[PDB]
Symmetry: C2
Subunit: 56 residues, 2 copies
């Protein structure tokens, strides 16, 4: 199933969607996302659109 | 200024927006987001909408 994850922060806000057999799997899959995005992830920047693309 | 951050993963995909004086500040602010969301963040779930809300 598909789940809609909301990344609501103070200086950062957004919406994302992970696909997992269940909410837990999704929750876990998401954890891996941030777990890997966190502070050692590969962040690419696109000045052309002032947008950054965090690729797992 | 406002920046549009794209969280593009394999099993997870989405879009977010951080506000920072510059791209770097934004990038840094975002890092704090994931840095704090990562594996020890406070994740709240809303079954009513199958949506999770990660609050910094």
């Amino acid at each position: 199933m598909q789940y809609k994850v909301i990344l609501n922060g103070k200086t950062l806000k957004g919406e994302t969607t992970t696909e997992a057999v269940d909410a837990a799997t999704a929750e876990k899959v998401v954890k891996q996302f941030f777990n890997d995005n966190g502070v050692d992830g590969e962040w690419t920047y696109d000045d052309a659109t002032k947008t950054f693309t965090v690729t797992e």
